[PDB]
Design a protein around this ligand. Sequence first.
Ligand SMILES: Nc1ncnc2c1ncn2[C@@H]1O[C@H](COP(=O)(O)OP(=O)(O)O)[C@@H](O)[C@H]1O
Ligand SMILES: [Mg+2]
Length: 323
Amino acid sequence: GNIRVYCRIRPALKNLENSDTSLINVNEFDDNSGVQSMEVTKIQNTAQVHEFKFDKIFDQQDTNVDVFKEVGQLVQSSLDGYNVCIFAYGQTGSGKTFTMLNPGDGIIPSTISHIFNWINKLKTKGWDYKVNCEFIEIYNENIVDLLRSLKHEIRHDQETKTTTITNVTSCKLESEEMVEIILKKANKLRSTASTASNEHSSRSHSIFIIHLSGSNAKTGAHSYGTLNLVDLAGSERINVSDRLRETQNINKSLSCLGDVIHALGQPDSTKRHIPFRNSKLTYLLQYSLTGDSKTLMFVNISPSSSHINETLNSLRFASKVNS
Ligand SMILES: Nc1ncnc2c1ncn2[C@@H]1O[C@H](COP(=O)(O)OP(=O)(O)O)[C@@H](O)[C@H]1O
Ligand SMILES: [Mg+2]
């Protein structure tokens, strides 16, 4: 299968943000290069420009609907039996949740809408599809069910190349509206909101799993594909001088994730040593990563000079992958 990396620059914050000490420049997509380039410069030293290439770059103009236009084609693949992974990577505040979960806008919401659209359309070709979904968070390497109102163990099935988690609430999606309630919950909890709880969310990975089961009599065919939409824990480098535990956790979690992606993109990713088991995340997702699977990595960045440094890390992490 294939791997891709997008960069998304969010618009600046009305008051507490500026770019007087830094400069981000994005160039127009090219063929000869078949990439899109960007440029990052720190004022303190204008002779050192950091270049970064990607599959695609979204700036402050591209809205959420603007982004899905590029993502819809990837998602559709599940109707064909492929598994898909989508990760939002970046520092707290870069806009990861916004991109994933923004009401009606988000990758998740849009993704759902999009499949139904197709499902409803495939009925004519003799296809009947069923959709189920799970919603958990990985926090300190422990699995947590975000759909409950309990020990969870990962079951991998090699006959099927499918995975399951014990004791995890699963939900039937017969319509967009069905999830749409949860999706509210979800976003608010992760908001700047007074009562919300981002301190925790910031420190954790939230995973939205979706499974499409399709069968067709007039062909007698079957299709099964899983989509994993990841709202990664904040990537901010912490000085480090519980919270320490929480810290180390993340680092290995992200690093591992980066090791794994990079390896999958290598020309000899077959019998290459891939740290799947190194983290709960990659362990959980190995089937949605290996083989024919499609992975999209989204790198979220802030445009203000105030984060120029994390911004650099973020692009380095991204860069490492794509290579
Ligand atoms: N593309 C975007 N356009 C408009 N506002 C955005 C965008 N990305 C993020 N924001 C705003 O930026 C703030 C931080 O976004 P958020 O998703 O919570 O960050 P993160 O999840 O990376 O910690 C929010 O108030 C959000 O509304
Ligand atoms: Mg968030």
